[PDB]
């Protein structure tokens, strides 16, 4: 009957790149999800599969919290059955998704005056990802037919590129933190409730 360590997820000072999205597993706690339901900052609260008011009286075996930071206009890709750089190469949700997506604009900390280099988004990949698949590999994307051997060049591209999040940047390009809640049910006792 301890409180789920949610704050450490949403209030973290550092979030992971969308290509290297972080995953916090939750267990054996009581989650007052209402705590984050009472906050206007978390405006974007697109949830699929369940109503938030209803699930506060529900129980699941495990809950997973995936977090990363994306661009302002690229939040939509965080939804089941979408396409783009993010959903194809970085963070794909399955067609049959039964959790929520929370996203808000962190322009005060996720942005720099000199431009930030702490954020990368995978741009090239030979194949689209599988639901919840993670790829941190940084091997050159061979688009031509001559091997790249590990140096960028013609038809040889280093995959990750860095977002130039800046304070004066346009909303569509202003920074954005995303928290993705998955809820699973299995034969194991439900250790997460409200």
């Amino acid at each position: 009957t301890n409180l789920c360590p949610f704050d450490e997820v949403f209030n973290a000072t550092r979030f992971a790149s969308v290509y290297a999205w972080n995953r916090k597993r939750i267990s054996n706690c009581v989650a007052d999800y209402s705590v984050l339901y009472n906050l206007a900052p978390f405006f974007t609260f697109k949830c699929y599969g369940v109503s938030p008011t209803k699930l506060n009286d529900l129980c699941f075996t495990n809950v997973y919290a995936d977090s990363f930071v994306i661009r302002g206009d690229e939040v939509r890709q965080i939804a089941p059955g979408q396409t783009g750089n993010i959903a194809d190469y970085n963070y794909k949700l399955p067609d049959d998704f039964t959790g929520c997506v929370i996203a808000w604009n962190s322009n005060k900390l996720d942005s720099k005056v000199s431009g930030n280099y702490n954020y990368l988004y995978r741009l090239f990949r030979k194949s689209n990802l599988k639901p919840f698949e993670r790829d941190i590999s940084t091997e050159i994307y061979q688009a031509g037919n001559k091997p790249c051997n590990g140096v960028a060049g013609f038809n040889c591209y280093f995959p990750l590129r860095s977002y130039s999040f800046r304070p004066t940047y346009g909303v569509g390009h202003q920074p954005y933190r995303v928290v993705v809640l998955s809820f699973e049910l299995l034969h194991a006792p439900a250790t997460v409730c409200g």
Partner: antibody
Framework: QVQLLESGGGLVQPGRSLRLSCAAS????????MHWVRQAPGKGLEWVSG????????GYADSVKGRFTISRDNAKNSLYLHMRSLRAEDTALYYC????????????????????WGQGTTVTVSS | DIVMTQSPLSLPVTPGEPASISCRSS???????????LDWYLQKPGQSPQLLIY???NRASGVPDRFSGSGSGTDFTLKISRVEAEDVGVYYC?????????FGPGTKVDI
């Protein structure tokens, strides 16, 4: 007992890549912010990069910014450091150190206190 | 982009006396909490370095009570109440506030 083992050293020509790996064994790897610190040959130390508890990088050194790329993996307890645009001035030992204060144990999250240090590798570059 | 200095650059110590070393910064490290973020580290020659003091003056774990840390603002000092035969090497002071972090040029202590 706590163990931090690094691997990836070896002579490589200028203008290539390398991938150093540091593996931790003996503690909850997700409550400690790791750091990668170089050590020039016969000189003082120099901070290179780091990573917080949530896989969120904390910036690189001013003179190295542009090439190095850090990454973490809590599932395999492994921290990795991809290195690009290798130049002659990048020959040094490399230690991977761990923070002291466990997160949420007391204002903001902790990042200081490189206490436990593995025996670094011996990366070198020449032609 | 913070630059730190140390003094004296190199001092010879003899076993059985205290010694004092000063680390100076450019911007005062007083955070909103009221804590200084400077750390003191000893890199023994031929062995990986080790931690001495964290959080300004809070003594690190596992080291004897012969070390003392003090100071604030832009000036901090480390004093060895009693020095012995196993206190020779290099000393560094490292910032823990405005990233990137930095390490001082280093003080060389010998017999």
């Amino acid at each position: 007992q706590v163990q931090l083992l690094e691997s990836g050293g070896g002579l490589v020509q200028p203008g290539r890549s390398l991938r150093l790996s540091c593996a931790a064994s003996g503690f909850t790897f997700d409550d400690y912010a790791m750091h990668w610190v170089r050590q020039a040959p016969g000189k003082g130390l120099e901070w290179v990069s780091g990573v917080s508890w949530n896989s969120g990088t904390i910036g690189y050194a001013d003179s190295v910014k542009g090439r190095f790329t850090i990454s973490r993996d809590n599932a395999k307890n492994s921290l990795y450091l991809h290195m690009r645009s290798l130049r002659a001035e990048d020959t040094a030992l490399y230690y991977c150190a761990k923070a002291v204060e466990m997160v949420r144990g007391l204002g903001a999250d902790p990042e200081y206190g490189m206490d436990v240090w593995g025996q670094g590798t011996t990366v070198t570059v020449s032609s | 982009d913070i630059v730190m200095t140390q003094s004296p650059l190199s001092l010879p110590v003899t076993p059985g006396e205290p010694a004092s070393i000063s680390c100076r910064s450019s911007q005062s490290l007083l955070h909103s909490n009221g804590y200084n973020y400077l750390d003191w580290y000893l890199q023994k020659p031929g062995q990986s370095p080790q931690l001495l003091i964290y959080l300004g003056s809070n003594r690190a774990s596992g080291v004897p009570d012969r070390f003392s840390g003090s100071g604030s603002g832009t000036d901090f000092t480390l004093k060895i109440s009693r020095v012995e035969a196993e206190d020779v090497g290099v000393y560094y002071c490292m910032q823990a506030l405005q990233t990137p972090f930095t390490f001082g040029p280093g003080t060389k202590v010998d017999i």
